Design a protein around this ligand. Sequence first.
Ligand SMILES: Nc1ncnc2c1c(Cc1cccc(NC(=O)Nc3cccc(C(F)(F)F)c3)c1)nn2C1CCCC1
Length: 254
Amino acid sequence: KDAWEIPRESLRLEVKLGQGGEVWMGTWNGTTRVAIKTLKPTMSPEAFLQEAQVMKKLRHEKLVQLYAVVSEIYIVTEYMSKGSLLDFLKGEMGKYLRLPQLVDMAAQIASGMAYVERMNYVHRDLRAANILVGENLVCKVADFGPIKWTAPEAALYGRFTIKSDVWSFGILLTELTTKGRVPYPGMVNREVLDQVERGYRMPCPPECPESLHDLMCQCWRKDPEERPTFEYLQAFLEDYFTSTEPQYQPGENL
Ligand SMILES: Nc1ncnc2c1c(Cc1cccc(NC(=O)Nc3cccc(C(F)(F)F)c3)c1)nn2C1CCCC1
């Protein structure tokens, strides 16, 4: 149909990375390592391809790049050698990560979202599970397919904006700071909602600088137009150890 189309004989689904459709570790044109997401006919093809249409209008360093499609369905993109942020934080790598390596990822994620912000788009499902990791702590926003991650106005009235994503980023920090634990521990969905409305907000994680929890609390402000742009968030996490915590010192796990 368009310049992105590719012949299925270019691909080679070498390893099955996950389930679903599903995700494989193919190889485009037998020389390029890539990731292949397939579809098991359950949604419409034109519905499944909506994910590809969007990836053609967004090209940034902290965003997983689209390479080519197969409308007869395959979606080819760059390959992130270390799976999602979740698996990574929960793997045996998560014990070696400290605040600096975690703020560095938080900031990169904020940057791809700063691009999104400028592009006037909204991700809607910004969370650790949809943030891929590659070599040298590289991170990129992604997608494949969550009230504990969704902003009040969004889940309650469908009011999804980039400010609702700012809410989700805030919840991402608790994931990076807890290294993979589910937000709002011990609480069930319709208990999270009834609670957050009442003013509740997650407490500062163990060994997490109160200045970093301060930022979370800004990403969780009740009034949407009060949360920060990703532009502020990115810069904030870029200057963290100089402007905010210049006396920081390594801890047991943070
Ligand atoms: N490159 C990869 N390499 C190894 N694993 C990968 C991927 C990927 C990237 C990938 C694979 C298949 C589809 C996508 N789709 C999208 O990123 N879609 C998307 C749709 C709209 C917007 C955006 C974005 F630009 F905002 F990121 C992204 C992304 N996902 N995964 C999964 C995560 C753990 C199980 C495997």
